[PDB]
């Protein structure tokens, strides 16, 4: 289709144009903290769904497969988003412009500080690598698609790999440096998967509780992980 016909620059400009906005929270307790994060995540999810439909090749897939990918990837995607916008805030997670939290504030919710530490370490890694905006949007698309239809998804994934390499070569990196940086970035996705799985385990634990109301959409996404 026309997704595979895109140039590298067009792929990058397309992903850049599709970027969701940075939402504000409604900034205490286990209940308050979870309230804020849940409300935020819920609003973000609506933008994520419309962002995915702008990821080249995604709307080519069956609605079944589109649903499956988002159900699998939504926390990874929220997390890579969070790590990206926290890059220039060492030791802090920028959940929202008006919600800059540190690891101590993550102690308010049980088991959350462990994830906070992992997210912080991921942000620190991106900061050290000097991750670029154009690289971030490629990685985020890879998370969506990775986490004749299965061949189509793989064809699009190769295209995004081509796009990442293009950005690196354009940045002046040697061939050896390109391959090394590509590997470094993709291995971070293993860590993002790990964090999502751990966090999801807490979510469908705090659910069985009724700690906070969590929304119908969130409840349905969460339910897919069980």
């Amino acid at each position: 289709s026309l997704a595979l016909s895109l140039t590298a620059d067009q792929m990058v400009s397309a992903l850049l144009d599709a970027e969701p906005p940075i939402l504000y929270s409604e900034y205490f307790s286990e209940a308050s903290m979870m309230g804020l994060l849940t409300n935020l995540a819920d609003r973000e999810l609506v933008h994520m769904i419309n962002w995915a439909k702008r990821v080249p090749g995604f709307v080519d897939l069956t609605l079944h497969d589109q649903v499956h990918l988002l159900e699998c990837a939504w926390l990874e995607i929220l997390m890579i988003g969070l790590v990206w916008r926290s890059m220039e805030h060492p030791g802090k997670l920028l959940f929202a412009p008006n919600l800059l939290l540190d690891r101590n504030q993550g102690k308010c919710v049980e088991g959350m500080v462990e994830i906070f530490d992992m997210l912080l370490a991921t942000s620190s890694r991106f900061r050290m690598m000097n991750l670029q905006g154009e690289e971030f949007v490629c990685l985020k698309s890879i998370i969506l698609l990775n986490s004749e239809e299965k061949d189509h998804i793989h064809r699009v994934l190769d295209k995004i790999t081509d796009t990442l390499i293009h950005l690196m070569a354009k940045a002046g990196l040697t061939l050896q440096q390109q391959h090394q940086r590509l590997a470094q970035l993709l291995l971070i996705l293993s860590h993002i998967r790990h964090m999502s799985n751990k966090g999801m385990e807490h979510l469908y634990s705090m659910k069985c509780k009724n700690v906070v109301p969590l929304s119908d959409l969130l409840l349905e996404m969460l339910d897919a992980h069980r």
Partner: peptide, 9 residues
């Protein structure tokens, strides 16, 4: 499901 509706648009 809700996700299915939002996508189908």
């Amino acid at each position: 499901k809700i996700l299915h509706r939002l996508l189908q648009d």
